[PDB]
Amino acid sequence: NIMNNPVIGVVMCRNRLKGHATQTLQEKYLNAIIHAGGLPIALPHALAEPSLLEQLLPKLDGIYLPGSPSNVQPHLYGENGDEPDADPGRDLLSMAIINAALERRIPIFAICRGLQELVVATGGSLHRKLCEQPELLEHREDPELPVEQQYAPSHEVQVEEGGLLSALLPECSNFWVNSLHGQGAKVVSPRLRVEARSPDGLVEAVSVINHPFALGVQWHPEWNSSEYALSRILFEGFITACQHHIAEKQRL
Amino acid sequence: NNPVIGVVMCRNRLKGHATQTLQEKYLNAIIHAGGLPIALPHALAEPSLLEQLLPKLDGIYLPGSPSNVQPHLYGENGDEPDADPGRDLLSMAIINAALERRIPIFAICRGLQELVVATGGSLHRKLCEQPELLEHREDPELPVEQQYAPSHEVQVEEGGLLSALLPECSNFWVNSLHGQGAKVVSPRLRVEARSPDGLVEAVSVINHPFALGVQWHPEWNSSEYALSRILFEGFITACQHHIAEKQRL
Ligand SMILES: [Mn+2]
Ligand SMILES: [Mn+2]
C-alpha cells in the first residue's frame, strides 16, 4: 500500500511457557491488521499503569482487542465466583484502555473476548455458559477437530440496520461467521447499539453510540482475513476510521 | 516522562497457532528502570513500517531467547532446529536502523549475538564442542532459580561502556544460559567483557552513544542485583539523552 500506516495498539494476553510468565499475541491477529494497512504494536499488561497509559495513548491511532481462550472475570460485571481460564492482567489493561479510548474517541476494533470486554466495560454483563441456555445454538468450536475446521463457518448473523455494519456492508444484511465462544453478551448497556444477532437472538456484534468507530464482533474475522471478503471490509473500515481519527486530530 | 522502549518479540507455537511472545521478566526490568515498553511484532521488519515507527521509539531492547540466529546470516552453513527467521529479520533490520539513527540499544544473550552478526561478526554454534571453554549452558533440569544463578566470572575491558557505568570494579560474576557465543567480533564493535576462558561476554558499538550487548541475563530479578540495576539504568539514561536530542532539532 502507498499509505501512512496508523499506529494500532494491540492488547496482549498472558501465558506461561517453559517456566516463565509471557505476554503473547497470536500472529493471525497481526496479519489481519498488516493486510488492512495498520502498523501494530503489542501492549503488555504492565502498561495498564495510569501514568504509562496516559503517555502512550496520544501515540495510538486505534485500539485492537484480539480474542483469547480466557474469559473476563465475573466480578467485573457484578457477579460472584470464577470461571476457568482467567487473565486478570488483560482484564485490567482492557478495561482501562477501553474507557480511555472512548473518552478520547480513539477507534476500537474488538474480536470475541474483545467484544465481551466492550460489553462489560460499558456496564453490561455476560452469559458464563451459553451451553446451559437451551434456546441458543452451539457457539463453541469442536476442540478435537483440526484448527481449520474450528474456524470454519459456524452460523449466520443478521445485521441490525442503522449502525456501523450497515454503513460498511450496504448489500449484506445476512452472512456466515465462524463461532468459537462459550460465553456471550447477556445484558447490553444502553451506551451500546446492537449491530448483529445470530438466529437464536444472541448478540454477536455491538458498537458504542456517539463514538466514531468502537466496534466489537463475537466471531473471528482475523482468520485468513485476506481470503474472506467480509473480514476484509471490517478491517478496512477500522483502518479507515483510524485514518479519519488522525485527520480529526487536527480539527480539535 | 518514561522513554518508549521497543522490545523485539520471539515467535512460538501455542495451541497450534503461531504466536509472538515476550517474557515478562524482560518487561519488568524495563518498567523498574523507568521505561515504557512496547512489543514489536516481526511484521514490523517491513522497511516502510519500520521507518514510520522508529521516530516514536526512544530505545531498542533485544531480549534473550531459546532460539539461535540462522548461520547463513553470518555466511556459514548448518542446521538450526530452534530457529526464528522472523526475529532474525526484525533484529538485523532494527539494529541497522538504530545504529544509523543513534537510537540506544540494549541487547541480552541472543540480542548480543544479533548485535555481533548484524555488524559483520560470526558466532560459535556449539560452545560445548570446544574443550578450552567453560560450560556456559544452564542445566534445563534444575529449577529456574539456580538456572539463573551466578555461574561464571567476567572481566571488564577498560575504556568502554562498562567502565563508564562501573568505574570501580572490573570483575563480577554473572549467570550463563547460552550454548552459542561470539566468535569473530567486527571492528565496528569493542569488546566490553570476557569470561576467564576468553569468550566475549559483552560488546558495544564504537561510534554510537549507547549500543550495548551482554551475553548473560541481567533481567532476572533485575531490581535485586547491583550490576543488573546499573545496566538498565544506564540504558534508560541513554534513552533520555536521545529524547533531548530529538527535541533540540
Ligand atoms: Mn457465535
Ligand atoms: Mn556465559
Swiss-Prot record, chain B:
Annotated keywords: Hydrolase
Disruption phenotype: Cells lose the hydrolase activity.
Residues in Glutamine amidotransferase type-1 domain copies: 11-245
E.C. designation(s): 3.5.1.94
Domain of life: Bacteria
BP term (GO), one: putrescine catabolic process
UniProt xrefs under InterPro entries: Class_I_gatase-like, Peptidase_C26, PuuD-like
Entry-linked SUPFAM superfamilies: Class I glutamine amidotransferase-like
Induction: Induced by putrescine and nutrient starvation. Repressed by PuuR and low aeration condition. Repressed at the exponential phase and highly induced in early stationary phase.
Molecular function terms, GO-annotated: gamma-glutamyl-gamma-aminobutyrate hydrolase activity
Catalytic residues (UniProt): C109, H217, E219
Keyword Hydrolase: yes
This protein's pathway: Amine and polyamine degradation; putrescine degradation; 4-aminobutanoate from putrescine: step 4/4
Effect of pH on activity: Optimum pH is between 8.5 and 9.
Keyword Nucleotide-binding appears in the UniProt entry: no
Catalytic activity: 4-(gamma-L-glutamylamino)butanoate + H2O = 4-aminobutanoate + L-glutamate
Enzyme class: hydrolase
Subunit structure, as described in the record: Homodimer.
Function description: Involved in the breakdown of putrescine via hydrolysis of the gamma-glutamyl linkage of gamma-glutamyl-gamma-aminobutyrate.
NCBIfam families from the UniProt entry: PRK11366.1 (NF008471)
UniProt record similarity statement: Belongs to the peptidase C26 family.
PANTHER family documented for this protein: GLUTAMINE AMIDOTRANSFERASE PB2B2.05-RELATED
Protein name: Gamma-glutamyl-gamma-aminobutyrate hydrolase PuuD
Organism: Escherichia coli (strain K12)
Taxonomic lineage of the native organism: Bacteria, Pseudomonadati, Pseudomonadota, Gammaproteobacteria, Enterobacterales
